[PDB]
Amino acid sequence: KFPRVKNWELGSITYDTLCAQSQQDGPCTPRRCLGSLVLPRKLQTRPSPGPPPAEQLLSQARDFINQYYSSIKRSGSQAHEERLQEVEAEVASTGTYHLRESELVFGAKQAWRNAPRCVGRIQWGKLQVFDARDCSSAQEMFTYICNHIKYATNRGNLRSAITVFPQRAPGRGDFRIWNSQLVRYAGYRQQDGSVRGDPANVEITELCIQHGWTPGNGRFDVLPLLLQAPDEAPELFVLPPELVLEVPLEHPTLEWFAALGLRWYALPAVSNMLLEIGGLEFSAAPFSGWYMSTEIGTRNLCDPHRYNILEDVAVCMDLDTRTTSSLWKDKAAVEINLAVLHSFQLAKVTIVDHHAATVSFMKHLDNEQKARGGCPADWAWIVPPISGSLTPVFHQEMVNYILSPAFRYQPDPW
Amino acid sequence: GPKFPRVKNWELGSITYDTLCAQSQQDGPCTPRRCLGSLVLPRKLQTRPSPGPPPAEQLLSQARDFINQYYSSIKRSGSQAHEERLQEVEAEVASTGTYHLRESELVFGAKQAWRNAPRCVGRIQWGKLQVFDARDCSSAQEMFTYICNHIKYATNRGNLRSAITVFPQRAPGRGDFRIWNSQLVRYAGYRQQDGSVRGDPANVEITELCIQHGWTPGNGRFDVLPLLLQAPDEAPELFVLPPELVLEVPLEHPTLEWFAALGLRWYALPAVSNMLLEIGGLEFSAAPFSGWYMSTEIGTRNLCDPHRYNILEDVAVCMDLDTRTTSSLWKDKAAVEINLAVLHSFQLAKVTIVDHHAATVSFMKHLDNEQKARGGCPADWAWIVPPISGSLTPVFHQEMVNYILSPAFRYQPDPW
Numbered sequence A: 001k002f003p004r005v006k007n008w009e010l011g012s013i014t015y016d017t018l019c020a021q022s023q024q025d026g027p028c029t030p031r032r033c034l035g036s037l038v039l040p041r042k043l044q045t046r047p048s049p050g051p052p053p054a055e056q057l058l059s060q061a062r063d064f065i066n067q068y069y070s071s072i073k074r075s076g077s078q079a080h081e082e083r084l085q086e087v088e089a090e091v092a093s094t095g096t097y098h099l100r101e102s103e104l105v106f107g108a109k110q111a112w113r114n115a116p117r118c119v120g121r122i123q124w125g126k127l128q129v130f131d132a133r134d135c136s137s138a139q140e141m142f143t144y145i146c147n148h149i150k151y152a153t154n155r156g157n158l159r160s161a162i163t164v165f166p167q168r169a170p171g172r173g174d175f176r177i178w179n180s181q182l183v184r185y186a187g188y189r190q191q192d193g194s195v196r197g198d199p200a201n202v203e204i205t206e207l208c209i210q211h212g213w214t215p216g217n218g219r220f221d222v223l224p225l226l227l228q229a230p231d232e233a234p235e236l237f238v239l240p241p242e243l244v245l246e247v248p249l250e251h252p253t254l255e256w257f258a259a260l261g262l263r264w265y266a267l268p269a270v271s272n273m274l275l276e277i278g279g280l281e282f283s284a285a286p287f288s289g290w291y292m293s294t295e296i297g298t299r300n301l302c303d304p305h306r307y308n309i310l311e312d313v314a315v316c317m318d319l320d321t322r323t324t325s326s327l328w329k330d331k332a333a334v335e336i337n338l339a340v341l342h343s344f345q346l347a348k349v350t351i352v353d354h355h356a357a358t359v360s361f362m363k364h365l366d367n368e369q370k371a372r373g374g375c376p377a378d379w380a381w382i383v384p385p386i387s388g389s390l391t392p393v394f395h396q397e398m399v400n401y402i403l404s405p406a407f408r409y410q411p412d413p414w
Numbered sequence B: 001g002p003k004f005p006r007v008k009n010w011e012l013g014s015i016t017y018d019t020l021c022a023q024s025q026q027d028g029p030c031t032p033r034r035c036l037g038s039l040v041l042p043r044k045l046q047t048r049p050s051p052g053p054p055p056a057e058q059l060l061s062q063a064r065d066f067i068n069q070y071y072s073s074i075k076r077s078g079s080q081a082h083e084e085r086l087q088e089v090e091a092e093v094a095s096t097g098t099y100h101l102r103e104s105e106l107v108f109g110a111k112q113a114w115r116n117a118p119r120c121v122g123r124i125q126w127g128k129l130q131v132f133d134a135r136d137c138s139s140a141q142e143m144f145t146y147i148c149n150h151i152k153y154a155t156n157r158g159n160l161r162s163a164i165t166v167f168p169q170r171a172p173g174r175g176d177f178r179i180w181n182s183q184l185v186r187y188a189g190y191r192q193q194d195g196s197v198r199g200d201p202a203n204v205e206i207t208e209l210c211i212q213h214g215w216t217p218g219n220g221r222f223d224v225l226p227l228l229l230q231a232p233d234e235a236p237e238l239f240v241l242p243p244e245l246v247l248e249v250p251l252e253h254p255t256l257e258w259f260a261a262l263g264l265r266w267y268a269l270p271a272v273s274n275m276l277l278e279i280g281g282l283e284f285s286a287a288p289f290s291g292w293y294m295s296t297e298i299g300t301r302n303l304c305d306p307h308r309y310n311i312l313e314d315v316a317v318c319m320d321l322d323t324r325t326t327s328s329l330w331k332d333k334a335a336v337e338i339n340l341a342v343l344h345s346f347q348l349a350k351v352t353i354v355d356h357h358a359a360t361v362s363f364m365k366h367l368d369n370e371q372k373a374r375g376g377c378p379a380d381w382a383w384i385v386p387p388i389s390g391s392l393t394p395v396f397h398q399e400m401v402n403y404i405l406s407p408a409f410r411y412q413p414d415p416w
């Protein structure tokens, strides 16, 4: 009933009992495992043709309120009893309900804690939660967002934060941020099929232009935001450059690296996921932390479908690009990740390397085994994209499952 | 759309549907409530020992399914030979509780077991396998002869050739044929007074089993072990492989002159010998198989795992790296040079080896072939993606569907 979980480096064994608290089904079955798929349409939180059934909603809300009071140890207080009755009252008459701010703050931190793809969860207790539920216009969202970013960047001393915009309502369209992150580089599909900039952002770049943006022509042009208030066309907002802290990439010993003209932005802020707490859904709730260097040095700069700089750097290093067996790719990638760490350190911008980060996740796993009898984790996302078995999490068996509060994928608004 | 897993490649943006998983008849460890995909041995890929003969009715369904597979493969499904073969199997089981495979059925089943292996990145080679039929073997000393012949054929002086040797199947009223060793070539692991280990820590128990069975130990880092071989109902017997049959490669580096002085080496032939070959419900408890190495198996896992030869810090020190901080990427730097040494050394010695870029590129081609041939390919992402340079290889960006197809290579309990 409970998985036996082994760490093959240390020989230690634990049992995951927390997984019995899952109530949402993942994509696997006993007949085939789909653990490596990025998004099955299933766990995804898509639009609906009306208001959720009140029984389901109140089951999730009761469990959540139950989590909250257990969390402040008044589980069973009259406050508890009373809050449950308010929630019951509000659902039965309106089909929905509202969270108290302190509940929202607990719920956002628990959603991060529960995120099986996040290797940075040892920080989960440390999150600035901005309540933006009194927002009624795109213009307003922009102001809250600009405030998120100033707070979170903090001159390079990054601090984790989330801004929560108004929940989804049966009666209307959603508040959405169309960009997948608050900071994104444009991707221009020049004539010859090519792409200048970040190919991951060709479609959003196109939407921006189509919605009146005047495009640049560089490899790192920061896109404007497309922000959407319920049932209205999204509106275009250009971020103040002063708010977007960037790091030009240099290498500690290769002189010519700086000449590649490469850079990346300081703040990782995901803006297209849905935050679910107690059955309520926040379709606009951007969150940010700081980067793990492999995100930049390895995936964003060396993926074949991204900036794909591996061969340029190898040729620069005078590597033998003729055969696979010279390991030119491996060698170039190491230096590019080294350049990322060097540059952030030099610019005094928070960053964490993949060894430090996975070591801290191992400690986090230990903490959560004690605290809750397990930790949901997605092995393929937790092991880094370089040097996998050189890190401790490679040798660690992991159990993956969905707990709520949760961050979830949702359909693109367009 | 289709009622099958939709599978995407994120580098290429292409999509496929896996229909082959429909054929899966054995349940894995995952459920809608939680995924156990990252577990090495869930109790869903391991075959416990049958002290008793499998129930006739369970055996026959498994047998009929495999015989249908065989006749489909030679495109005589529904045929008179087909119906006749089925009948014969039902009679054999019907009177003796078991049955036996024709030679060409064994060859098909063995190649199919490899094709069906979700954790193997080398399956593009699956059609090319020398199948040694050793089902006449009747003693521990004969197994030894069969195995030496295997090694000589497979090794072929450095031009390696895939091969498997099949010993008699599990039989009701009879103990099992077993090779106690996990591979045909294993370096000794000697526990030290300090509690440390000299040699390969993965092999401590077998090293001690050998000793306990009368082997006289050495005290090197790379002492080849003797084979513990077991014929039915007999205690296992100790056999020493003549040195000349075990080809080894001393490791050197193409530009780092001092690396040779490290005195490192690895053997040329990867030959797994403790897995169970299952065909049509029949169980071959001893059926060693071999291919050639992918360089990361040696350079990354065997040499750099913390619980294996653990040489990262040694090599980093020689490269004069800052081993006192993580963000110098000293582990990453050293690993790369250790893997390059392995490739360089195997090439120089003209022993077959495949780097992890070439191997995963070839696996992508296999996935394409198999989509067409069978509408899918069961694959264990965590094992297929290499332990270094993961997203620098094509398989990282390919979603995969994992399931159990039979004929199969299965884990089985230790014989002791």
Ligand code: HEM
Pocket (backbone or CB within 6 Å): A108, A112, A115, A117, A118, A119, A120, A121, A123, A127, A160, A161, A162, A270, A287, A288, A289, A290, A291, A292, A295, A352, A357, A407
């Ligand atoms: C404090 C620093 C943190 C670090 C170093 C960090 C690290 C990571 C990494 C390496 C990933 C993978 C990203 C990718 O491959 O695209 C990620 C995923 C994730 N992080 Fe964290 N994390 C941290 C903070 C945050 C915070 C503040 C939250 C939420 C409140 C967050 C929630 C998540 C979620 C939901 C995912 C999955 C994203 C997806 O599915 O695309 N993390 N994090």
Ligand code: HEM
Pocket (backbone or CB within 6 Å): B110, B114, B117, B119, B120, B121, B122, B123, B125, B129, B162, B163, B164, B272, B289, B290, B291, B292, B293, B294, B297, B354, B359, B409
């Ligand atoms: C021709 C060369 C081949 C290549 C390069 C190759 C490569 C690999 C690799 C890298 C693994 C992972 C090993 C590990 O991490 O411990 C593996 C596993 C596997 N291979 Fe292949 N393979 C080859 C041939 C063979 C052949 C000939 C067979 C069988 C007929 C075989 C059957 C398997 C099986 C069943 C596994 C899984 C074993 C386990 O769970 O420990 N492979 N192979």
Ligand SMILES: C[C@H](O)[C@H](O)[C@H]1CNc2nc(N)[nH]c(=O)c2N1
Pocket (backbone or CB within 6 Å): A036, A037, A038, A380, A381, A382, B010, B396, B397, B398, B399, B400
């Ligand atoms: C197909 C496969 O799941 C996909 O490439 C995953 C693998 N692991 C990953 N891990 C992280 N952290 N981020 C990713 O985007 C991915 N992509």
Ligand SMILES: C[C@H](O)[C@H](O)[C@H]1CNc2nc(N)[nH]c(=O)c2N1
Pocket (backbone or CB within 6 Å): A008, A394, A395, A396, A397, A398, B038, B039, B040, B382, B383, B384
């Ligand atoms: C815990 C985890 O499943 C384990 O370390 C796996 C990961 N991937 C692997 N991949 C290969 N090829 N070989 C292995 O031994 C493993 N070990």
Ligand SMILES: [Zn+2]
Pocket (backbone or CB within 6 Å): A028, A032, A033, A034, A035, B030, B034, B035, B036, B037
């Ligand atoms: Zn699974």
